[PDB]
Write a protein that binds this ligand. Structure first.
Ligand SMILES: Cc1cc2nc3c(=O)[nH]c(=O)nc-3n(C[C@H](O)[C@H](O)[C@H](O)COP(=O)(O)O)c2cc1C
Ligand code: SF4
Ligand code: SF4
Ligand code: SF4
Ligand code: FES
Ligand code: FES
Ligand SMILES: [Ca+2]
Lengths: 148, 156, 905
């Protein structure tokens, strides 16, 4: 993208300057918490910070900072290429747009599928994950990771 | 006892150019020293502190905070098997037992020939293909206890 | 703001958090990670209260009171059942790993963790699993380390790093193996590391010097005293047991030294317990040393003084105002000499003239933290006036405080403030002969000889005000740095100019006065600070007298045949050969001192004076603040044959025996009345502390806590009959528990802080009007002089630049916090901490001499050839040689002197 002029100085002739870096971590689960993420970005121990102030006003090095997930930023270009009405007209639910959902752990087809919000967990587990494996009985599930 | 090599110093300074504050290159400086020497020794804390302009206490605090910055000598290869819940359901315990019975070491220990050090890591973000292992940079998925004595013998 | 705690309405400051507001109102909330001086971080999770949305709310929500603003219309409950359960749970979680260590822990009975364990009502252990353990580090001679007792409250790192700007302490590790210490074993390098033993709420960091002769806080006999180890005058609580000085605690003073001491004051008390101290009057007759009692010492001394034609007295800046005045009355005003040299006296009275006639307000130590730009000229503040250097660091962090206030971030939310103000700081410009410990935060450091430091000051004053004298011969690069300093100082609302007498240069003080006057003429709110040398340098300067060279001349010429030397070793202020010859010439030398000095060999009579632990008196601050110190213990309680009286008591009874042939062991208030009657400039010392008739509802002030133990046993090996309680006629304190130490008593002198449920240094919360503020009925101590209506004139004596001349070596002074001050370097625990005797050289001068680092060179000063090993000094300038002032053999009068015959030994 830098060699194609999509990053760096004067992107698409607009005068907007943007530099993108990749900072690889050193393995702590608390580094994903956004204020602790900011602290680890500044080369510190990854302790979180009390909010307020939120990072939007005082974040990385005291500057305005916005922390967003990978998937939110990946949702952004489709929104701006197809429009607001398209993003609001793919799911009849109060949570707009599509979400990567998936079942894992001793199912027939553990994996990841892009589904609209309001898709029930049963149809994910049966149609997409294939149900539970042979000779296994479903007893519990966690909807959203180890912290749910 | 410790003196930073020239390539390490250039890599650390190039990482320092990426940030508003030079303190923000501490994690990458530690990872650069660790990549060059397997682990971060005692003198590297003071050397990195001198290069970055931050106290050695801050460098030691960062190095001992992060699990993947090794402050003790490791083997030539670091086996990192997943410990978390999806690999627990998929049976990581058999993989850990196979690794222990092959290497004759406990987790956190290094073999007597310095070839492998065995470590439990957190979730490797590969839960649909569990159980998962990470030898030095390669992620091995769909693990079975019978495939350990072939996986380990391609890391000399 | 209006808050409602448990349905009770209170008026608080809306800019405070709920924890400090509720502690100021007398309510009890347990807390660990919060401190009044460090701000709020919300770590320990102990201070939880229940906040309600309004008065008609019953559910509520657990909030952290230290992280919650005490805004108008707040509704909280401390005594809520769920809040109480949570606070007990936090104490329980800290107790799961805590070692079974209280009997063998130096913090016991003085431990904040013990107090908050009891306060939450947690006394039942239901945790049955293992406790984590930790190895300990060696942190040097002063601080003992026990990481097992840690509760990970983070107070130590926040103090040592974010407050004191120390670099060698930190937190390491992770989840529940979090470690607080140095990266490896070694001495803690901060000059203010000793405050860890009170900052740490547990027994991790403990006073190793106290641990050698440990006793519990209830067994201590305390008094309010002033630290004698430099001129900053930090209030201390010395505590004794079994007749020896055990500990120095910080005594809170919201105007001077609020929570913190430096390490010299905290750990340099060991000279009081030296076994070679004089304990009785001793008369030298031939080779015999006859021990006398008080009465016949006065009779014999008065007989010899009466038969002599002229008697001169030599005071000291170590001695209190009363002792120097009593000597001045014994010998007369015309025969009294200050014990300091002529150059030291010139610099001291010049600094006094600047302070009390320059028209520029001199700030107290606490007020230094609120200034917006600092220029330190010639003063190694960290090594001579250390607590001023700590206050300067707070003043430097003021810029981040202002930046965060601009974003409506509350002033107690310290982590947000430090994040907003990343590396921004208020301008600091330090100037010395070499590098200082303030150079890490200094915007600029100027390493130059004292003439060039003075010339830089004069040039700054001329650039600020064109009526100030100009400097000729400034280099363009130095001129650019001068304009940097001038733009920083002129743009500040509150500039502060720090200088002092330790540089050895009159012109440095003159240049500092010129800068302060130039800033005052521009309408700035400029303050000026002068760091003196000793505890009562300013008081001895205010009283005045002849120089030590004049006294030595009177002894050498034979005009004076009797000399009374008060608390002065005389070798720090003059050459030892001349002093010894002059004292051997005098047929009567009487030394009144509490330490065994070298001139006592020549002394015909030696009076065993009392040190500050065994005496009362008044000392004058570097800011002109008169402060009373009170006697801690009676030296004759355990050793009945000890005659160790106050120096003013000795000299007053000697004057009485000289005049009327009867002794008069006077009272302290009579001597103070005599001072304020005879010296009107010292009239403010009457109001320093109330007189000995002061009572709190009829009772005196107790020196020791109510649970003081061993009353019928501590002396039982000497005699089973309990002795009479030692009477105190001098002060309002009693030598017993039978007195008052209530937190609500109307007084300013608090010998120690204790309240029920608060056995730790956190008990100082109960003695303050608001936490971290002033003492409830005013901080003790009174300023002697107000700011003058009109200032001085500009000093037109601009010196020439330093020229290195061949054969001569200008002595550059190096001060050490451990070693330079006389009494503290006599203390035995300071010898490990003291630097080895090293003579500093430029690389160019060392290469010219053919001398490498470590080789020993010999030089002759005043006919005395001494030899020291060489350290190479990069920051020094050529033609200068660096010497450690105040060490053994290097008198502080060598600063600014020249050196000859410097060659390799
Ligand atoms: C302990 C902890 C760990 C977290 N780890 C991550 C993470 O690894 N990745 C992530 O995107 N968010 C993580 N979060 C959530 C972030 O705080 C934040 O909500 C998110 O990263 C960015 O917000 P967004 O969802 O609008 O993009 C974590 C939160 C906590 C409390
Ligand atoms: S730190 Fe306090 S609670 Fe812990 S062992 Fe010492 S006295 Fe007891
Ligand atoms: S060592 Fe003391 S001050 Fe530091 S975190 Fe532990 S208990 Fe708190
Ligand atoms: S700064 Fe001076 S007065 Fe204060 S504690 Fe230190 S030596 Fe004592
Ligand atoms: S649980 Fe093992 S890869 Fe995620
Ligand atoms: S005192 Fe408030 S959380 Fe520690
Ligand atoms: Ca007395």
């Amino acid at each position: 993208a830098t060699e194609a002029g999509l990053l760096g100085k004067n992107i698409m002739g607009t005068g907007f300057d943007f530099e993108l870096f990749v900072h690889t971590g050193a393995g702590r689960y608390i580094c994903g918490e956004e204020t602790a993420l900011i602290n680890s970005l500044e080369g510190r121990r990854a302790n979180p910070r009390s909010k307020p102030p939120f990072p939007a006003t005082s974040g990385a090095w005291g500057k305005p900072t916005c922390v967003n997930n990978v998937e939110t930023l990946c949702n952004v270009p489709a929104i701006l290429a197809n429009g607001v009405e398209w993003y609001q007209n793919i799911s009849k639910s109060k949570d707009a747009g599509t979400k990567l959902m998936g079942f894992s752990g001793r199912v027939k087809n553990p994996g990841l599928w892009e589904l609209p919000f309001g898709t029930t967990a049963r149809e994910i587990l049966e149609d997409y994950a294939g149900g539970m494996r042979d000779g296994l009985k479903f007893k519990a599930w966690q909807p959203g990771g180890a912290g749910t | 006892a410790f003196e930073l090599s020239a390539a390490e110093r250039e890599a650390i300074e190039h990482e320092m150019h990426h940030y508003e504050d030079p303190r923000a290159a501490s994690i990458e400086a530690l990872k650069i020293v660790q990549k060059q020497r397997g682990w971060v020794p005692d003198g590297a804390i003071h050397a990195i502190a001198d290069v970055l302009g931050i106290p050695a206490s801050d460098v030691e605090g960062v190095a001992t905070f992060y699990s993947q910055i090794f402050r003790q000598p490791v083997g030539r290869h670091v086996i990192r098997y997943c410990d978390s819940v999806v690999c627990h359901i998929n049976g990581y315990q058999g993989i850990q037992a196979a690794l222990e019975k092959k290497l004759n070491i406990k987790p956190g220990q290094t073999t007597f020939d310095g070839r492998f050090t065995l470590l439990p890591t957190c979730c490797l973000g590969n839960c649909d293909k569990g159980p998962n292992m990470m030898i030095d940079e390669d992620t091995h998925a769909h693990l079975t206890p019978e495939a350990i004595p072939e996986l380990l013998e391609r890391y000399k | 703001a209006t808050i409602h705690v448990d349905g009770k309405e209170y008026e608080v400051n809306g800019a405070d958090n709920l924890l400090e507001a509720c502690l100021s109102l007398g309510l009890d909330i347990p807390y660990f990670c919060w401190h009044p001086a460090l701000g709020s971080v919300g770590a320990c999770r102990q201070c939880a209260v229940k906040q309600y949305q309004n008065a008609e709310d019953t559910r509520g929500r657990l909030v952290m009171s230290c992280m919650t603003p005490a805004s108008d219309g707040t509704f909280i409950s401390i005594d809520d059942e769920e809040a109480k359960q949570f606070r007990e749970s936090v104490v329980e979680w800290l107790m799961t790993n805590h070692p079974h260590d209280c009997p063998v822990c130096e913090e016991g009975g003085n431990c904040h963790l013990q107090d908050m364990t009891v306060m939450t009502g947690h006394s039942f252990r239901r945790y049955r699993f293992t406790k984590r353990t930790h190895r300990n580090q060696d942190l040097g001679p002063f601080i003992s380390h026990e990481m097992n007792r840690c509760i990970a409250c983070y107070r130590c790192v926040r103090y040592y790093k974010d407050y004191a700007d120390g670099t060698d302490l930190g937190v390491y590790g992770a989840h529940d193996n979090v470690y607080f210490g140095r990266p490896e074993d070694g001495t803690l390098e901060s000059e203010f590391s000793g405050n860890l033993v009170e900052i740490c709420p547990t027994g991790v960091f403990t006073d190793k010097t106290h641990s050698e002769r440990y006793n519990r806080k209830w067994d201590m006999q305390f008094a309010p005293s002033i630290c004698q180890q430099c001129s900053i005058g930090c209030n201390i609580s010395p505590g004794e047991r079994y007749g020896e000085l055990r500990r120095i605690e910080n005594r809170y003073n919201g105007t001077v030294n609020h929570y913190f001491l430096c390490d010299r004051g905290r750990f340099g008390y060991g000279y009081v317990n030296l076994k070679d101290r004089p304990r009785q009057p001793v008369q030298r007759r031939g080779d015999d040393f006859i021990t006398l009692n008080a009465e016949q010492a006065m009779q014999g001394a008065a007989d010899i003084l009466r038969q002599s034609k002229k008697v001169i007295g030599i005071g000291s800046p170590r001695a209190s105002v009363e002792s120097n005045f009593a000597l001045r009355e014994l010998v007369g005003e015309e025969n009294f000499y200050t014990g300091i040299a002529h150059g030291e006296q010139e610099r001291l009275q010049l600094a006094l003239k600047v302070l009390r006639e320059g028209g520029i307000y001199t700030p107290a130590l606490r007020e230094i933290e609120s200034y917006d730009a600092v220029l330190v000229l010639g003063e190694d503040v960290t090594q001579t006036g250390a607590r001023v250097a700590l206050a300067v660091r707070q003043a430097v962090k003021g810029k981040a405080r202002e930046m965060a206030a601009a974003q409506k971030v509350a002033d107690w939310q310290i982590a947000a403030i430090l994040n907003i103000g990343q590396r921004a700081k208020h301008p600091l410009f330090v100037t010395n002969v070499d590098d200082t410990r303030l150079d890490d935060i200094a915007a600029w450091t100027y390493r130059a000889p004292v003439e060039d430091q003075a010339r830089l000051g004069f040039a700054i004053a001329h650039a600020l005000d064109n009526s100030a004298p100009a400097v000729d011969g400034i280099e363009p690069e130095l001129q650019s740095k001068i304009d940097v300093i001038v733009q920083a100082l002129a743009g500040a609302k509150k500039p502060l100019i720090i200088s002092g007498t330790n540089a050895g240069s009159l012109e440095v003080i003159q240049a500092a006065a010129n800068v302060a006057k130039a800033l005052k003429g521009r309408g700035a709110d400029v303050g000026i600070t002068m760091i003196a040398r000793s505890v009562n340098s300013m008081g001895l300067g205010i009283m005045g007298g002849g120089s030590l060279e004049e006294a030595l001349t009177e002894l050498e010429t034979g005009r004076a045949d009797a000399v009374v030397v008060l608390e002065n070793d005389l070798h720090r202020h003059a050459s030892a050969i001349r002093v010894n010859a002059a004292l051997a010439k005098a047929p009567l030398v009487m030394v009144v001192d509490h330490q065994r000095t070298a001139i006592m060999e020549n002394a015909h009579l030696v009076l065993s004076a009392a040190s500050f632990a065994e005496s009362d008196g008044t000392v004058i601050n570097n800011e002109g603040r008169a402060q009373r110190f009170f006697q801690v213990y009676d030296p004759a309680y355990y050793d009945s044959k000890t005659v160790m009286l106050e120096s003013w008591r000795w000299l007053h009874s000697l004057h009485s025996t000289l005049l009327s042939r009867e002794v008069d062991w006077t009272q302290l208030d009579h001597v103070i009345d005599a001072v304020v009657a005879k010296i009107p400039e010292l009239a403010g010392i009457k109001d320093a502390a109330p007189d000995a008739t002061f009572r709190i509802r009829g009772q005196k002030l107790a020196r020791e806590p109510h649970r003081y133990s061993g009353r019928t046993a501590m002396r039982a090996n000497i005699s089973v009959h309990e002795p009479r309680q030692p009477q105190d006629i001098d002060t309002m304190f009693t030598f017993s528990m039978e007195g008052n130490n209530q937190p609500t008593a109307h007084r300013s002198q608090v010998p120690f802080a204790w309240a029920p449920g608060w056995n730790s240094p956190q008990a100082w919360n109960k003695f303050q009007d608001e936490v971290g503020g002033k003492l409830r009925f005013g901080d003790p101590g009174v300023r002697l002089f107000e700011t003058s209506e009109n200032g001085l004139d500009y000093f037109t004596s601009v010196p020439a630049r330093f020229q290195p001349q061949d054969g001569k070596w200008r002595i550059a002074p190096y001060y050490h916090l451990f070693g330079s001050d006389e009494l503290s370097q006599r203390a035995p625990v300071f010898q490990s901490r003291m630097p080895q005797p090293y003579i500093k050289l430029n690389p160019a001068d060392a290469a010219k001499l053919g001398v490498n680092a470590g080789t020993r060179v010999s030089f002759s000063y005043d006919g005395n050839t001494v030899t020291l090993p060489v350290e190479i000094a990069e920051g020094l300038t050529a033609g200068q040689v660096g010497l450690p002032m105040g060490m053994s053999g290097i008198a502080p009068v060598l600063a600014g002197a020249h050196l000859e015959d410097l060659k390799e030994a």
